[PDB]
Design a protein around this motif. Structure first.
Motif, mmCIF file in Angstrom:
data_model
loop_
_atom_site.group_PDB
_atom_site.id
_atom_site.type_symbol
_atom_site.label_atom_id
_atom_site.label_comp_id
_atom_site.label_asym_id
_atom_site.label_seq_id
_atom_site.Cartn_x
_atom_site.Cartn_y
_atom_site.Cartn_z
ATOM 1 N N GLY A 171 0.728 -0.991 -0.577
ATOM 2 C CA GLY A 171 -0.733 -0.046 -0.113
ATOM 3 C C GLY A 171 0.900 0.985 -0.229
ATOM 4 O O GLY A 171 2.006 0.615 0.233
ATOM 5 N N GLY A 172 0.266 2.121 0.093
ATOM 6 C CA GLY A 172 0.926 3.614 -0.086
ATOM 7 C C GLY A 172 1.285 4.327 1.079
ATOM 8 O O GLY A 172 1.115 6.267 0.405
ATOM 9 N N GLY A 173 0.296 4.386 1.993
ATOM 10 C CA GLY A 173 0.768 4.942 3.239
ATOM 11 C C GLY A 173 2.510 5.719 3.210
ATOM 12 O O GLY A 173 3.235 4.766 2.923
ATOM 13 N N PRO A 174 3.147 6.191 4.077
ATOM 14 C CA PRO A 174 4.310 7.278 4.026
ATOM 15 C C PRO A 174 4.823 5.503 5.174
ATOM 16 O O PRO A 174 4.563 5.460 6.097
ATOM 17 N N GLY A 175 6.340 5.423 4.761
ATOM 18 C CA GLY A 175 7.301 4.467 4.533
ATOM 19 C C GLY A 175 6.870 3.226 4.757
ATOM 20 O O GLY A 175 7.482 2.310 4.573
ATOM 21 N N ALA A 176 5.609 2.841 3.278
ATOM 22 C CA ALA A 176 5.370 1.334 3.186
ATOM 23 C C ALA A 176 6.756 0.731 1.596
ATOM 24 O O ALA A 176 7.088 1.635 1.424
ATOM 25 N N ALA A 177 6.427 0.005 2.398
ATOM 26 C CA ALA A 177 7.143 -0.851 1.604
ATOM 27 C C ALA A 177 7.400 -2.134 1.646
ATOM 28 O O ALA A 177 6.455 -2.843 2.258
ATOM 29 N N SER A 178 7.905 -3.640 0.385
ATOM 30 C CA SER A 178 7.064 -4.764 -0.103
ATOM 31 C C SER A 178 8.086 -5.406 1.868
ATOM 32 O O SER A 178 6.683 -6.655 1.824
ATOM 33 N N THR A 204 5.138 15.452 10.723
ATOM 34 C CA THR A 204 6.549 15.020 11.981
ATOM 35 C C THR A 204 5.662 13.888 12.240
ATOM 36 O O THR A 204 5.321 13.281 12.043
ATOM 37 N N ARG A 205 6.362 13.125 13.349
ATOM 38 C CA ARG A 205 6.690 11.474 13.985
ATOM 39 C C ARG A 205 5.040 11.544 14.370
ATOM 40 O O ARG A 205 4.413 10.581 14.024
ATOM 41 N N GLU A 206 4.608 12.335 15.301
ATOM 42 C CA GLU A 206 2.867 13.176 15.308
ATOM 43 C C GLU A 206 1.935 12.677 14.607
ATOM 44 O O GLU A 206 1.457 11.930 14.825
ATOM 45 N N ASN A 207 1.903 13.177 13.425
ATOM 46 C CA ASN A 207 1.569 12.912 12.214
ATOM 47 C C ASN A 207 1.149 11.035 11.665
ATOM 48 O O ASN A 207 0.357 11.706 11.036
ATOM 49 N N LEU A 208 2.656 11.058 11.926
ATOM 50 C CA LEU A 208 2.758 10.062 11.089
ATOM 51 C C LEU A 208 2.159 8.585 12.268
ATOM 52 O O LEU A 208 1.649 7.367 11.677
ATOM 53 N N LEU A 215 8.098 0.621 15.463
ATOM 54 C CA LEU A 215 7.457 0.859 13.990
ATOM 55 C C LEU A 215 7.166 2.276 13.326
ATOM 56 O O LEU A 215 7.518 2.268 12.638
ATOM 57 N N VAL A 216 7.039 2.728 14.502
ATOM 58 C CA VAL A 216 7.034 4.140 14.746
ATOM 59 C C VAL A 216 8.651 4.981 13.733
ATOM 60 O O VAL A 216 8.339 5.945 12.714
ATOM 61 N N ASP A 217 9.232 4.127 14.695
ATOM 62 C CA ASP A 217 10.285 5.059 14.511
ATOM 63 C C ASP A 217 11.038 4.691 13.097
ATOM 64 O O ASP A 217 11.590 5.692 12.676
ATOM 65 N N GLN A 218 11.068 3.858 12.880
ATOM 66 C CA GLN A 218 11.345 3.266 10.767
ATOM 67 C C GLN A 218 10.419 3.767 10.588
ATOM 68 O O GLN A 218 11.238 4.079 9.348
ATOM 69 N N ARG A 219 9.167 3.394 10.392
ATOM 70 C CA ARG A 219 7.964 4.398 9.394
ATOM 71 C C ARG A 219 8.232 6.034 9.127
ATOM 72 O O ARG A 219 8.575 6.263 8.090
ATOM 73 N N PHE A 220 8.719 6.344 10.682
ATOM 74 C CA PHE A 220 8.895 7.879 10.131
ATOM 75 C C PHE A 220 10.309 7.784 9.076
ATOM 76 O O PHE A 220 10.220 9.661 8.218
#
Lengths: 284, 284, 284, 284
Positions: free
Chosen positions: A38-45, A160-164, A182-187
């Motif tokens: 999917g297409g959300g911020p930080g998404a990958a296979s 921002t981390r808060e928006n993610l 998971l928030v640390d890596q995606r951000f």
């Protein structure tokens, strides 16, 4: 199986050289399947399917492709309608890898890519498994943009981390899946200038000359293969009301709804998802 | 205001001469409105709108047009997609009467014709009132063909009074509206060999080259005018689930559903329908 | 496995002795499951599930119960709300057979019986599999009675071979399942005076003092177990719009829709149905 | 016709004295109508209906009642299920003013109160106009709580101007209606300690012994009067999918949906809403 053991690269031509990252496993198996995140911020296979790839690699040759703009694939600042662009990339990759007809599994933006590819290269697309897909979905009840799409947008404009973390929380039913790791890596992935440029270019590719390519609910009556629609009942990004036109107009459609499940179907219903997919795609 | 006093003919061009019969009233009023009847066996402008014409003609210049295949209008053995064909006829009539931009009221098939006209001749169509319209409706829950449409097909194959009366029964909520007189008036028009040739010509038109012209749920996102969708909650021909895509994707849509009302809304809910239509179209 | 090898009888008390016929298989297995057939003329356990029983008997101890009014179970002329009555019969049979908590599989009227039983004896009902069930279903779009319910009713009041065959044809997507043999046997069973008296008494039990017992869409938010809703997309008796309140209000609900499938889900999607059921019920 | 000139108090009995504030106009007219505002932070009769009261008071005797917990009405720290409680207050006011059977107009929470009254005191309620009503609405597609309801909850926990303005933004389609003046007028009432005590008292009331009194989608099949359901197509609080059970199960239902309209229908679509309401309620 690790991010590194499965990691691969291929260069394809879409209006120029384009580098695609993908993950490969189950090379012994005879049925190939392509996974599209999917297409959300930080998404990958790997982040979106990491665990599903191990399980599905027992039955199939898995290709999990980082879509252009995502992961370690190229992040051009200019392209046409995103699904058409991503479908051309994948067609480049099919030709290079010598694939014939392959089933596709796609979540959200990846679902739309899988459908655009299935409409544009009908002979190359097998059975489709689509988890809360974009494009073929049309929210007959939900006002657009949905809460989940607004939180995706808000991040793109205020990274921002808060928006993610607000986006990650509307992506799932069980909010304890959204660990501080998971928030640390995606951000870190999502807030690079190249990933932020890619997301804006993806998001603004839907309002362009070929905008009708994104309105795939108008076209899916042309699909001839079996299609499995999978929805989390509590999906706040692409809610269930978006399933109805595809379910009605695809001749060989099925729909599976999971209660107590959001947009991250392949993680939140890991075991039930993998069993549906293995059974629908034959069994390898 | 009778059938005879209001009766008119025009000869228009659609790949050759085409006689249309229509009814005209309120020649005293400056705002024109066109009424388009449904596609049921023996349907026509006067049997379907006679009493609406009297009320509407207090406020408007009313043209109620017998669509090609129906009433006293030409019944060709062959034509293209029906709505495309009927919209080209109507365009011919508009140029002859020197109409500019005119609102359109249309039930079922005549609702599809209204929309096909509004798409094909965008500057010539004003506000649309559409009662259980065909074409832009797509039944997300109802298996096709619906009980109502199967009765329309059955009459086409076995054109008996009994099959006509079975069709009329599923068209309305209050079956006491289906008088032996209405049945005799519909069955008189329905059972002529020209009428029965027009019905098969129509069926063939939906399977032909331009069949997509019939699938206007894929196109109504293009309508720029206000559109009032009106549904009977108990419509067994074009059921209520068929309203959802049009209500979602027409920018300036409104929907009014009447409980205790079937497919013949302009009669089953005469006074309420007349008041809604007069107000929505601007009162004269 | 045959109608005779599996055939069994038990007598239970519901306001007096009541004889229930049922079919038993897989006596070696440890998980018991109860199958409850639908309510159409001539319906019975063996005719409705004959083939499914063989397959499911590989994993479970199958009890397929002829509901009161059906098959070889008693056909009283007087009872209360049918689902409440049938649920009391089944509770009698559970006590007699020494069953604890058992999963239930129910089509249409049998689905309603399974839910009524699950609400009234919460400790005795396990996982539920419900194929186009009655009672919990509420047709939010379809006018009631539906075409399929009208054809069921018409047979009860005019029990001709032609009316029975009209009902059997709206029960399935593929009309070639309705062989002249299957019509011969259903008509013979359905048109006996005892079966015709039972059907009328069932059909008129819904409008009585305890009518709220049939309105189970008001109650299913009280179910705590996992529930699998299964629908044929083309079901004309209990259409898909009837699934929505149960899917929304049952906490642990799932929904599987099969395209190209009617009301006789367990026959028309035999293999896909049996695999969903075996997997949802654990695996025996 | 001002806040001051129309202002009234009554002391009614609900387990003890309860002061209600309301606004009264059109004392010249013989047909009374009661208006019930929504449950948003700082909602009241005058801020929510001030301009509707002026128009309606040309035709009707208008009572717009500040519900308990809101405006200048008593704000008790504890009460039962809110709608039950508010309906008992209203019943008290009806007896004091000597009202017989009176129509009721109600938005969101005040729509639930209207229905609870019409169920609990069936002879005292006339025609119902209900705009995105709470309680009888059940969101078959929208995950609960909706984006709108989460913003209502967030203000309750962190009562800042910013959280109030985020709530008002999702209440309307045209965000330019959210003026700094409206925000200042709502935030003045919303942020009093009595108001914030009334909000928590309200939340507690939905989880308590009589919580079913809040689930009026299970009961509206009992309403015998005409009911006009009015929805904004873009309502993000009580979205359009919440209308379906009420439209199906209220015998004398009608539904009007406005495109380009959110949750504040009486203002967003002022002239059309006023005309619909005047006509549906019989014009005076």
């Amino acid at each position: 199986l690790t991010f590194e053991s499965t990691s691969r690269f291929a260069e394809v031509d879409v209006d120029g050289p384009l580098k695609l990252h993908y993950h490969e496993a189950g090379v012994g198996n005879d049925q190939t399947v392509v996974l599209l995140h999917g297409g959300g911020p930080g998404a990958a296979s790997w982040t979106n399917f990491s665990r599903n790839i191990a399980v599905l690699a027992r039955h199939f040759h898995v290709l999990a492709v980082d879509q252009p703009g995502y992961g370690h694939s190229d992040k051009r600042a200019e392209h046409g309608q995103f699904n058409r662009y991503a479908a051309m990339a994948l067609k480049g990759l099919f030709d290079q890898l010598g694939l014939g007809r392959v089933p596709l599994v796609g979540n959200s933006l990846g679902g739309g890519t899988a459908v655009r590819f299935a409409l544009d290269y009908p002979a190359r697309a097998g059975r489709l498994v689509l988890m809360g897909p974009g494009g073929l979905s049309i929210n007959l009840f939900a006002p657009d943009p949905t809460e989940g799409v607004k939180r995706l947008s808000k991040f793109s404009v205020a990274p921002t981390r808060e928006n993610l973390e607000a986006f990650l929380r509307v992506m799932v039913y069980d909010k304890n899946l959204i660990t501080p790791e998971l928030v640390d890596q995606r951000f870190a992935l999502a807030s690079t200038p190249e990933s932020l440029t890619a997301t804006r270019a993806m998001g603004k590719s839907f309002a362009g000359a070929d905008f009708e390519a994104g309105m795939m609910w108008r076209e899916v009556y042309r699909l001839r293969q079996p299609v499995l629609l999978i929805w989390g009942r509590e999906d706040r990004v692409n809610p269930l009301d978006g399933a109805l036109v595809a379910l009605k107009t695809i001749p060989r459609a099925q729909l599976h709804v999971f209660g107590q499940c959001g947009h991250w179907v392949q993680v939140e219903k890991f075991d039930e998802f993998n069993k549906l997919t293995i059974e629908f795609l034959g069994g390898g």
